[PDB]
Design a protein around this ligand. Structure first.
Ligand SMILES: CCCCC/C=C/C/C=C\CCCCCCCC(=O)O
Ligand SMILES: *[C@@H]1O[C@H](CO)[C@@H](O)[C@H](O)[C@H]1NC(C)=O
Ligand SMILES: *[C@@H]1O[C@H](CO)[C@@H](O)[C@H](O)[C@H]1NC(C)=O
Lengths: 50, 50
């Protein structure tokens, strides 16, 4: 909370508020770098070059 | 429509087009200042420092 601030944070299939008191079975993290106008393409049902 | 212009304006419960033709009961205004990427936390069902 006092180090990193996110311009985008959105969750699908769950709610963010419940994330504190819920336990997850298998978790994977995928990481990369895009430009700003492409950050809206990382979502289900989108089209574009990314 | 002449001086003040808003980057964010979102209504919950009603339609903005129906903001006219309608007459309200008990209106309260809460005012504060945040930074640029915290404005997306002022919504129902959000998590974060704000
Ligand atoms: C990367 C290790 C954890 C991986 C599994 C995560 C489980 C919990 C789900 C989401 C929490 C990730 C960080 C969310 C930060 C919110 C920041 C904010 O909105 O202000
Ligand atoms: C917040 O950041 C400052 C920066 O030095 C650090 O000293 C402090 O420990 C941080 N807060 C917490 C709770 O660690
Ligand atoms: C809108 O703003 C301009 C800026 O000075 C002003 O001249 C004009 O009278 C304003 N319109 C109205 C209806 O007051």
């Amino acid at each position: 909370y006092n180090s990193t601030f996110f311009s985008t944070f959105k969750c699908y299939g769950v709610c963010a508020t419940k994330l504190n008191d819920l336990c997850f079975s298998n978790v994977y993290a995928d990481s990369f770098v895009v430009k700003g106008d492409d950050v809206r393409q990382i979502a289900p049902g989108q089209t574009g070059v990314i």
